Amino acid sequence: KLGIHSNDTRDAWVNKIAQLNTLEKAAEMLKQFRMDHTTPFRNSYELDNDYLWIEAKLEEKVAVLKARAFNEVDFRHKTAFGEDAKSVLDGTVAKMNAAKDKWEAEKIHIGFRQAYKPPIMPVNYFLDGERQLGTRLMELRNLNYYDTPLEELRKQRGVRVVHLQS
Amino acid sequence: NRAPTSVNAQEVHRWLQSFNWDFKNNRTKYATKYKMANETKEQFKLIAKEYARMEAVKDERQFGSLQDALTRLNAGVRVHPKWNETMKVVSNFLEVGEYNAIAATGMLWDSAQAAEQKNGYLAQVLDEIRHTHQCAYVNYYFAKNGQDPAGHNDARRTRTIGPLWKGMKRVFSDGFISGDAVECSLNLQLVGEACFTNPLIVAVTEWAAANGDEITPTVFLSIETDELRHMANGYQTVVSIANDPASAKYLNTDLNNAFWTQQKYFTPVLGMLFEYGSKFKVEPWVKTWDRWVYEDWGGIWIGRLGKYGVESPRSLKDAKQDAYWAHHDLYLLAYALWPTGFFRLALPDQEEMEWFEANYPGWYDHYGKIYEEWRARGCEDPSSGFIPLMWFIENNHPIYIDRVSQVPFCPSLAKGASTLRVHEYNGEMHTFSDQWGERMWLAEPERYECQNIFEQYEGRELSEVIAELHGLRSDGKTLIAQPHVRGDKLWTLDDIKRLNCVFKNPVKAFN
Amino acid sequence: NRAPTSVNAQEVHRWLQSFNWDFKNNRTKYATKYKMANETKEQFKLIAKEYARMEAVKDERQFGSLQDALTRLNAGVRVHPKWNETMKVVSNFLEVGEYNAIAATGMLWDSAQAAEQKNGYLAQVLDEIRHTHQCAYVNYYFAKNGQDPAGHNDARRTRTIGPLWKGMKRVFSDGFISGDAVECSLNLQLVGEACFTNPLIVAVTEWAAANGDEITPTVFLSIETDELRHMANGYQTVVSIANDPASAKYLNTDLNNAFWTQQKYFTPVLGMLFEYGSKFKVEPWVKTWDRWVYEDWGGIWIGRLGKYGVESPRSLKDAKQDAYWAHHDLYLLAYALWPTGFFRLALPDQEEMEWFEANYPGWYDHYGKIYEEWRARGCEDPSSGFIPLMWFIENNHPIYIDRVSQVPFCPSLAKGASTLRVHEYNGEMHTFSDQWGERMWLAEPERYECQNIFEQYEGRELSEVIAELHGLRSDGKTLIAQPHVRGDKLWTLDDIKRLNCVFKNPVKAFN
Amino acid sequence: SMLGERRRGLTDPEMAAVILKALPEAPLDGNNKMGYFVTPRWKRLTEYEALTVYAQPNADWIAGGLDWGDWTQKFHGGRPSWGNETTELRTVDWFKHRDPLRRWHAPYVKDKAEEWRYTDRFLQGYSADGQIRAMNPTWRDEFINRYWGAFLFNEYGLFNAHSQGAREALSDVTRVSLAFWGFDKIDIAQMIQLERGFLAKIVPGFDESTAVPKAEWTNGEVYKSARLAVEGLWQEVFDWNESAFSVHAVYDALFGQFVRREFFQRLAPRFGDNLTPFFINQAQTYFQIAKQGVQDLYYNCLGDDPEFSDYNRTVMRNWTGKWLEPTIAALRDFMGLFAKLPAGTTDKEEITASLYRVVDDWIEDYASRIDFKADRDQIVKAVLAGLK
Amino acid sequence: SMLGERRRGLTDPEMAAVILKALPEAPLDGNNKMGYFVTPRWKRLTEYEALTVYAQPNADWIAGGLDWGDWTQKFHGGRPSWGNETTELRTVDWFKHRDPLRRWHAPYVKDKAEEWRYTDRFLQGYSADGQIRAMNPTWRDEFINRYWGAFLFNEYGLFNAHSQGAREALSDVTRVSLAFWGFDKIDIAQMIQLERGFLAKIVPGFDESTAVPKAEWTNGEVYKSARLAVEGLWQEVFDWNESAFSVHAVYDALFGQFVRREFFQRLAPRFGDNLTPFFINQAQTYFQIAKQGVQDLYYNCLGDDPEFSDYNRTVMRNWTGKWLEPTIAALRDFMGLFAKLPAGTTDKEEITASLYRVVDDWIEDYASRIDFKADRDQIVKAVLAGLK
Ligand SMILES: [Ca+2]
Ligand SMILES: [Ca+2]
Ligand SMILES: [Ca+2]
Ligand SMILES: [Fe+3]
Ligand SMILES: [Fe+3]
Ligand SMILES: [Fe+3]
Ligand SMILES: [Fe+3]
């Protein structure tokens, strides 16, 4: 079974997810998953064709568990890990505002997503963060966007140039 | 005094700017480097009720023509086969552009702080909903009354099988809504609509009428009447941010990136649909392009905004340099991969080859011969056991997918651009076809992680992908896509299975 | 229970019958021999607002097609010359039928005593108003976008010049409103609409389509959708008086007179307009007529009214015998008097002559030879000094006007009916073409005193009558009417004046 | 088949080629304006005029006619299809009239259709919103059902008064206006029943039957003089112009306007009733629309006719006086209805003020146009004398 | 030229001949139904569904999506074009929603257009009929101009609360419904201003400037808590579903309905004001239309989701409690307006009963659907504390 929308990989993860019966274990698995399989900093590209769908299934379980474990105030203001969402948001924005350059900035933003994307952090705080973090990231990145030659930009990004043609 | 009196839209609009009020958190919810001026005004003085009336009038004329005279004239049938197929792509692909423009303008409405500028964007939010339904209606009408309903009837799901769809989502979906609201406005309004869609829509009606299609002109001409408002919105976006220090720093960079994004896909795709998807020609794409991009937009339109700091895109020259053969280079790929579409394609006939050679000297010696050979190999016949993709494999002509634009390219065969950049980064290979898209990825890697068809289909047999993604006709065996537009000898799923074509990721060859 | 609730047309119509109340002078203001039952019901349960909505929907389609697609296709121009001319007569003459039908049903509404029957007629009152404006719009559209606006733009006044108009007023103007309300209902609904109007309207769209006219089908097919309500009005009119003892005494005579009145004009006129006013043919008129009058109306329709005492008109057999050559006989007269029209006529071409002979054995030896004689003599060339009316005088073939029907006839030349009855009464001569019309005059001389064209124009020189009644085109010199449909060599008022044609009353020859 | 058997000249290659070959190089006349010979009322000829004026085939012997000769078929006895003999009024041209709103069939049904569809939506919103909860039960079960419902027969009667005019009108522009004036009246009548039918659906014991309101109209006392005035304007008048003039510029302008605007549209709101005013808004919009037409015909055209100005004003003043009496009588009988209102609903002071609004509006919009000398104080006094 | 230079394939003999020869004998597929693969909500697939469902190019990782793979271009940082992360609610399929009124663009603008044209007719008939004469001066210059006027800002803010949703909605059917809910709100705000502009034209001295109403809204006491709630719903809510749900199933269902229906619609008639009710009738029609769509999305689709029903109700109960408090505060401050009325206009019992109607309707149409345990008397008691 190797399909696009249905396959053994997806089936396997649905089973593993079905075994996440407590919030803390489920939330930790979701965060680990994001570190292992999302963004260009992912630890591995092995689940490239299915991670988006599997992540969504993992999110579903963490959400249902959180709504059952958290009282109303905490569901609105705490992260699945028990952190005060406002504190995390403000602290991350502070780091972003102190970022010395676009390289530091991109790591702060990308890392924030991997660690706090809903249902970890309440949507209201998470998107407020997207609003503020993205603004600084773009400001830093779009300043003198074309000054660095491609030859040097490739080195800054740290890619391995495999083949060039022209 | 009891004289019959009333109140119109302008009379109410006079006080609309005052509707917004101040409070600490009254600010946009989206990330942006720019600041839209609080006093920005709008060109048209509309209110909800009047907007609805003016669109309602247009609808009545449009649907009246479609349901009465055009149906009585059998207008859905008396269209050239090639064009009936072209409209499956043209109408459904534009539909997604219209659709995402709804969300894009919802985002701009949120960005604007002046009640009048919000209102201008609002009218476009509604117009884009209308346009989505209009494009949907074209496919709906051709499916209901046309010569070949397949594709017209399920493009929303069958478009996911092919590679051409991926690029459309970049320029007409994600490019419209993902990023700085201003960057999106540039892709959508300042570049997308002003440079391409506005002229495109009208051109489509010309090509349509020439090939017997009076359905598309009826709808698209009606769509076009709403564009003035959208152009004003785009121009107004620039005015609203012109007096902010950020504008001098970032505007031209976002504009240049938007221009390249839009041009990268439309330069080759539009010309391809027009020239190859038609029987009767209206005008060579080359001259249509130069007038649109260079003269009208890159000259007249772009010039008017010079006073606001706007400048001609720095990649404009490269764009023109790569433009000439672009669409010709792409049709070779689209036809080679014909089994992955939701429409039927045809090889250029003798009469068409002459036209191509006449308007593009050197066409025959390159593309002409190739098509003649594929014809000889029996690419149109189900019993040949041949698909042009095999020819690319036999002649070591790998086809790559640009990581940023999603536009397919074969650098070893193209007469246009032939550059290829391959990088490895954190365990993944990435292939780029130009220096502008490469910069985009190096600077913003996390923005471009789209998996290409080869990555997703790697190791999969062709017939299985088509079957899984429902690329079959109602009989459950004949393919929707075809290598010819005749009514007999249509390829079946079994004809494809027998080819035993198994996809592989071309980048894996690199060490 | 706050469920969304409303009320529909049927729910209100439920109590419509009780809207009328009893009181001394509650009775029709018009003379009549019958009594309409005050408990008569109507077939369609409508109220003013729902009626408006269903018609509004039809209007939007129609005008939408006309203003949009059809105009974009230049539908007003790409029509055969002969048919462009024929529609000047068909639409305007039909217009007056629609118009007087308003007054007719207004008279019927006043006649009905049951609230529902009044409401039924009322619906038609409004429908006939819509039809008047629809026929007006057809002429308006052809004047606006057609190949020859003259006649289309002023038929309301230029129609008064020719003899064909007089008979039209008899069947579709006076026949609809002058007489016993019930008699009028028979002329209008029972015979007019059920026997002719209904079948004719659709037939017209067929001939129109065959000759490139998509404007007329768009409007006429819409008009046709309203006819079911009028058919019902006619049917209910009979049911309404079936119990009145007077019915058995008068119904069949008013109907027979009504049948004869209507067929007397349409049998020759409609077949003439269809076969001689077109290039492409749909079906031979003899075939059409037999189906309409005998199969559909005389059989099926009249049959369903049998239980109400209605019988086939006694003059039916006579109608069929007089019918065969009727339309061919009339065109000879219409063409001979071409300068009195407001439209351009053409002589049959070679293909048409072959079609006429094939469908009407013997046509060539009579009509064909005559048209060829007239053409060789130069009836189409303004410098010939020849108008076919001169041929009739030369060969002693007087043309008379039936005092009752106003239909022109030439007994000495006719291949069809050739009877003629001439009488003098109190210093006035009268000419009749059939026994039914003669009886009508004898029994009701004061109902038929219409002056004919020879009586009014007696002693007048042709060009003077034309000039006086504005039978000229914009340049003030070229005639609206013409003996051919080509663009060059159009006849002028001077070409006519030079003929020195002076009208004479043909009946004075018996003095 | 996919292509069908019928070949059309616009799309069939063979047939179309023949047609194109026969076409002239350019139109055979540059005057593409249908109705160009019509005298425009405004700056330029309108679609309304082009499509309507001269559709009626009148000969010159009927003021304005363009045709000639007698009719082809007349009534037994000799009465003409249409003739000067059907109305006392005279004019230099029966085609001068122009509906200020320029309504031909299309605009007319478009507007009424919009109203029908919005009405439907409104009713669905009203019921779902439970707005019926705040309506006074006595005002509903008694004044809306019985007294408002009875008024439907008044409108229905005025509607029917138009039947003869539909038949005798001497011009197209006048026939169209007349037909629309009457159709709007029956519409109002059917809207009154519609409301009673709606109430019946959302109010458990409400009976939509016209029994109660009809008996009130036929045998009641409040509408006695009203009905007598109606039965007369409808079945005793044989002059189409006297009927339209008296109905719209006399009776309905005074009685009708008082009942609709000064009684129900003024008091219904005081009983938590926004339902009835919804429908009365329509009736008033219609009344005001028709007024502009009525005014243009009898004043601008007839009352001010270059040749019969004096004559017509005399005939109309005569008509005004003839029907002003039955009208005032109608208003008097109606006054007896205020006594049925719960104590404290209104006072003689408000009523007197409402009567002057009607009388003053009438004098300003109608009476003063034909120089008819009416006394506001005496009329109000005459009517006001009906209060019990 | 009469014929033109452009040759069309449908009518040009030569070109049509070429086209006709290339045509197949019959359609290459008998399935002529666009959207045949969509699961119909009703008996047969509707035009509404065919033209709308799946227009949004979502991949399977966004519940119900048919596409595959990541977006082609995302926001700086990596945020997806559309994603599950933009809302707390979860579902088996975001494409399940159906507007019970089946409104796609055409039917939507058609109805609003009818309402616009009839509004113009109504106003021309209202002014010409002089109905303004009977309107209480104080009600007009104080309550309509200042207080009804200030309410336009409430509706305007609710309109603006929909901006993020227009951008983030996860399906076409939800995006279209949301856009129409928002568009109707700006329309109402504009109709309030429309009425003020109308009054300025027919009443000498009436100032249509928004300065007074705006000052009332921004600095007055009656609308203080209402404004605070609106500012929160609009700008402090980043979850598109919390926004639409809280606006339509909490705030506007309680505060909005009370103001529009229990204050202005209920009292305007008492001051001879039939004008304001004409517009509120539209607002209430719009409210009831949106309610059907709101109930379908939040209760039928999300609250009753086969897999996330319990989860979604927990979240909606959470949101209800979060916004009920600010909503009660808004109603509480609004109670202050009653003391500004002329003595005898209304009393505590009427006010209380009207509060209960709104609360009981809200419990029935919204609260009970998600098992929110609302206490009707405790809610009313908290609001009454605001009566001065
Ligand atoms: Ca390697
Ligand atoms: Ca306070
Ligand atoms: Ca009390
Ligand atoms: Fe658009
Ligand atoms: Fe646009
Ligand atoms: Fe008719
Ligand atoms: Fe009819």
DSSP-derived secondary structure for D243-281: HHHHIIIIIIIIIIHIIIIIIIHHHGGGGT--HHHHHHH
Longest pairwise C-alpha distance within chain D: 85
Three-class DSSP labels, B372-422: HHHHHCCCCCCCCCCCHHHHHHHCCCCCEECCCCCCEECCCCCCCCCCEEE
Separation of alpha carbons B499 and C481, rounded Å: 73
Query: Which helix or strand (DSSP H or E) is residue B220 part of?
Result: helix B215-224
β-pairing verdict for B408-409 and B400-401: antiparallel
Is C67 within 8 Å of chain B by CB? yes
Task: At D188, list the tokens.
Answer: 């109002």
Q: How is residue C77 annotated by DSSP?
A: T
**Identity (one letter) of the amino acid at D7?**
R
Mapping DSSP to helix (H, G, I), strand (E, B) and coil, where does residue B46 land? coil
C195 is catalytic: no
Closest by CA to E331, choosing from E263, E277, E236, E246, is E263
Classify residue D314 by burial, with Cβ atoms within 10 Å: 0-12, 13-18, 19+: middle
**B457 vs A contacts (CB less than 8 Å):** 4
Residue that has been written with the tokens 């996911």 in this structure: B160
Give the number of beta-carbon pairs within 8 Å between B and D.
Answer: 13
| Number of residues assigned to chain A | 166
What Cα–Cα distance (Å) separates residue C475 from each residue in A18, C10, C478? 91, 57, 7
Residue that has been written with the tokens 């009780």 in this structure: C18
Domains A2-69 and A70-142 share a fold: yes
**E236 vs A contacts (CB less than 8 Å):** 124
CATH of domain A2-69: 1.20.1280.10
Does the distance separating the beta carbons of B65 and C63 come in below 8 Å?
A: no
Nearest ligand to the C-alpha of residue B507? 1
B173 CB contacts (<8 Å, ≥6 apart)? B96, B97, B99, B100, E57, E71, E72, E81
What Cα–Cα distance (Å) separates residue C190 from each residue in B109, B419, C32? 63, 83, 17
- Are E247 and E226 in contact by the 8 Å Cβ rule? The answer is no
Closest by CA to E71, choosing from D286, D74, D345, B178, is B178
Query: Which helix or strand (DSSP H or E) is residue B264 part of?
Result: helix B245-276
Separation of alpha carbons B312 and B66, rounded Å: 42
Mapping DSSP to helix (H, G, I), strand (E, B) and coil, where does residue E3 land? coil
Q: How is residue C263 annotated by DSSP?
A: H
A91 CB contacts (<8 Å, ≥6 apart)? none
Domain ranges of chain A: 2-69, 70-142
Mapping DSSP to helix (H, G, I), strand (E, B) and coil, where does residue C400 land? strand
Please calculate the CA angle B497-B498-B504 and round it to the nearest 5 degrees: 60
Three-class DSSP labels, chain A: CECCCCEHHHHHHHHHHHCCCCHHHHHHHHHHHHHHHCCCCCCCCCCCCCHHHHHHHHHHHHHHHHHHHCCHHHHHHECCCCCEHHHHHHHHHHHHHHCCCHHHHHHHHHHHHHHHCCCCCCHHHHHHHHHHHHHHHHHHHCCCCCCCCHHHHHHHHCCEEEEEEC
- Are C338 and C85 in contact by the 8 Å Cβ rule? The answer is no
Chains D and B touch (3+ CB pairs under 8 A): yes
- Are B231 and B223 in contact by the 8 Å Cβ rule? The answer is no
β-pairing verdict for B420-425 and A160-165: antiparallel
Separation of alpha carbons A13 and A32, rounded Å: 14
Nearest chain E Cα distance for residue B174, angstroms: 5
Is C65 within 8 Å of chain B by CB? yes
Is E11 within 8 Å of chain C by CB? yes
Does the distance separating the beta carbons of A123 and E87 come in below 8 Å?
A: yes
Q: How many CB atoms lie within 10 A of CB E42?
A: 11
Separation of alpha carbons C414 and C416, rounded Å: 5
Question: What CATH number corresponds to the domain at position D11?
Answer: 1.10.620.20
Separation of alpha carbons C208 and C217, rounded Å: 7
Cis? peptide before C398, omega within 30° of 0:
no
Selected for mutation to probe chain A from B26, B33, B161, B255 (highest A CB count within 10 Å) is B33
**Identity (one letter) of the amino acid at B55?**
E
Q: How many CB atoms lie within 10 A of CB E138?
A: 13
CA–centroid distance, B167 to ligand 1, in Å, is: 28
Separation of alpha carbons A14 and D305, rounded Å: 91
**Identity (one letter) of the amino acid at B321?**
Q
Does the distance separating the beta carbons of E168 and B160 come in below 8 Å?
A: no
Q: How many CB atoms lie within 10 A of CB E15?
A: 20
Separation of alpha carbons D368 and D374, rounded Å: 8
Nearest chain E Cα distance for residue A36, angstroms: 16
Task: At C15, list the tokens.
Answer: 């109590």
Task: At B386, list the tokens.
Answer: 């041949």
Residues in binding site of B = 98, 128, 131, 193, 227, 230
Question: What phi and psi values does residue B164 have, to the nearest 5 degrees?
Answer: -65, -30
Separation of alpha carbons C249 and C245, rounded Å: 7
Separation of alpha carbons E359 and E250, rounded Å: 10
**E15 vs B contacts (CB less than 8 Å):** 210, 212, 280
Mapping DSSP to helix (H, G, I), strand (E, B) and coil, where does residue E127 land? helix
Q: How is residue D30 annotated by DSSP?
A: S
Closest by CA to A130, choosing from B103, E84, E76, is E76
Separation of alpha carbons B47 and B49, rounded Å: 6
- Are C184 and C175 in contact by the 8 Å Cβ rule? The answer is yes
Rounded to the nearest 10 degrees, what angle do helices C326-336 and C245-276 cross at? 60
The region that residue E78 occupies, defined by phi over 0 for left and psi between -120 and 50 for alpha, beta otherwise, is: left
Counting the structural domains of chain B, the total is 1
Does the distance separating the beta carbons of C29 and D238 come in below 8 Å?
A: yes
**C75 vs B contacts (CB less than 8 Å):** 69
User: Which residue does chain E place closest to C4, by CA atoms?
Assistant: E288
Provide the edge-to-edge strand list for the sheet that holds A160-165: A160-165, B420-425, B428-432
Please name the member of E84, E88, E236 whose beta carbon is closest to the beta carbon of A56. E84
- Are C85 and C277 in contact by the 8 Å Cβ rule? The answer is yes
What Cα–Cα distance (Å) separates residue E264 from each residue in E219, E228, E271, E275? 21, 21, 10, 11
Residues of the domain holding B101: 1-511
List b or e across C454-465, with b for residues whose CB sees 16 or more CB atoms inside 10 angstroms.
Answer: beebeeebbbeb
Q: How is residue B151 annotated by DSSP?
A: T
Counting the structural domains of chain E, the total is 1
Closest by CA to E250, choosing from E354, E334, E341, E370, is E370
Question: What phi and psi values does residue B428 have, to the nearest 5 degrees?
Answer: -135, 140
Task: At C88, list the tokens.
Answer: 């000047």
Closest by CA to D328, choosing from D280, D362, D364, is D362
Mapping DSSP to helix (H, G, I), strand (E, B) and coil, where does residue E238 land? coil
What Cα–Cα distance (Å) separates residue C478 from each residue in C374, C467, C481? 22, 10, 9
Helices and strands per DSSP (H, E), number in chain E: 16, 0
Task: At C3, list the tokens.
Answer: 């469920």
Separation of alpha carbons D277 and D269, rounded Å: 8
Q: In this complex, which chains have at least 3 CB pairs below 8 Å with chain E? A: A, B, C, D
User: Which residue does chain C place closest to B222, by CA atoms?
Assistant: C68
C191 CB contacts (<8 Å, ≥6 apart)? C255, C258, C259, C261, C262, C297
DSSP annotation string for E306-358: TTTHHHHHHHHHHHHHHHHHHHHHHHHHHGGGGGGSPTTS--HHHHHHHHHHH
Residues of the domain holding E299: 1-388
Q: How many CB atoms lie within 10 A of CB D306?
A: 9
Task: At D140, list the tokens.
Answer: 């509903």
Task: At E58, list the tokens.
Answer: 């979502």
Is D111 within 8 Å of chain E by CB? yes
- Are B332 and B410 in contact by the 8 Å Cβ rule? The answer is yes
Mapping DSSP to helix (H, G, I), strand (E, B) and coil, where does residue D221 land? coil
Q: Which residues pair with E59 in a beta bridge?
A: E67
**Identity (one letter) of the amino acid at B481?**
A
| Helices of type H across chain D | 13-22, 47-52, 105-128, 137-138, 149-160, 163-168, 172-202, 211-218, 224-235, 240-246, 257, 265-267, 275-295, 309-335, 348-365, 376-384
- Are C405 and C172 in contact by the 8 Å Cβ rule? The answer is no
- Are C212 and D22 in contact by the 8 Å Cβ rule? The answer is no
Separation of alpha carbons E65 and D329, rounded Å: 74
C193 annotated ligand binder: yes
Separation of alpha carbons B58 and D47, rounded Å: 20
What is the resolution of the experimental data for this entry, in Å? 2.0
**B78 vs D contacts (CB less than 8 Å):** 3, 11
Please name the member of E106, E125, E179 whose beta carbon is closest to the beta carbon of B59. E106
Nearest ligand to the C-alpha of residue B423? 1
Residue that has been written with the tokens 């009525």 in this structure: D294
DSSP annotation string for E19-60: HHHHS-SS-S-S---TTTTSPPSSSS--HHHHHHTT-S--BT
**Identity (one letter) of the amino acid at C150?**
A
| Number of residues assigned to chain D | 388
Separation of alpha carbons E387 and C285, rounded Å: 86
| Helices of type H across C159-244 | 163-169, 175-177, 181-185, 198-210, 215-224, 227-241
Question: What phi and psi values does residue E383 have, to the nearest 5 degrees?
Answer: -70, -45
Task: At C151, list the tokens.
Answer: 């006649």
Query: Which helix or strand (DSSP H or E) is residue B429 part of?
Result: strand B428-432
β-pairing verdict for B408-409 and C421-424: unpaired
Q: Which residues pair with C478 in a beta bridge?
A: C492
Separation of alpha carbons B438 and B431, rounded Å: 9
Closest by CA to A117, choosing from A158, A72, A62, A36, is A62
Q: In this complex, which chains have at least 3 CB pairs below 8 Å with chain B? A: A, C, D, E
Closest by CA to C476, choosing from C463, C459, C461, is C463
**Topology adopted by domain A70-142:** Monooxygenase (1.20.1280)
- Are B93 and B188 in contact by the 8 Å Cβ rule? The answer is no
Separation of alpha carbons A80 and A120, rounded Å: 5
Task: At C29, list the tokens.
Answer: 């203001």
Q: How is residue D25 annotated by DSSP?
A: S
Separation of alpha carbons B17 and E196, rounded Å: 16
Separation of alpha carbons B335 and B164, rounded Å: 11
Q: How many CB atoms lie within 10 A of CB D142?
A: 16
- Are B151 and B342 in contact by the 8 Å Cβ rule? The answer is yes
**E131 vs D contacts (CB less than 8 Å):** 261, 265, 284
Q: Which residues pair with B344 in a beta bridge?
A: B482
Closest by CA to C315, choosing from C263, C256, C365, C274, is C256
CA–centroid distance, D356 to ligand 5, in Å, is: 57
Exposure on the CB side of residue E164, measured as CA atoms within 13 A: 26
Question: What CATH number corresponds to the domain at position B48?
Answer: 1.10.620.20
What Cα–Cα distance (Å) separates residue B490 from each residue in B345, B380, B382, C203, D320? 12, 9, 7, 42, 84
Does the distance separating the beta carbons of B73 and D11 come in below 8 Å?
A: yes
**C2 vs E contacts (CB less than 8 Å):** 361
Mapping DSSP to helix (H, G, I), strand (E, B) and coil, where does residue C1 land? coil
- Are E227 and E218 in contact by the 8 Å Cβ rule? The answer is yes
Does the distance separating the beta carbons of C56 and D110 come in below 8 Å?
A: yes
Chains D and A touch (3+ CB pairs under 8 A): no
| Helices of type H across C112-210 | 115-145, 155-158, 163-169, 175-177, 181-185, 198-210
Separation of alpha carbons E163 and E234, rounded Å: 9
CA–centroid distance, B123 to ligand 5, in Å, is: 10
DSSP annotation string for E175-214: HHHHHHHHHHHHHHHHHHHHHHHHHHHHSTT----SHHHH
Classify residue D378 by burial, with Cβ atoms within 10 Å: 0-12, 13-18, 19+: exposed
CA–centroid distance, E378 to ligand 3, in Å, is: 22
Separation of alpha carbons C195 and C285, rounded Å: 15
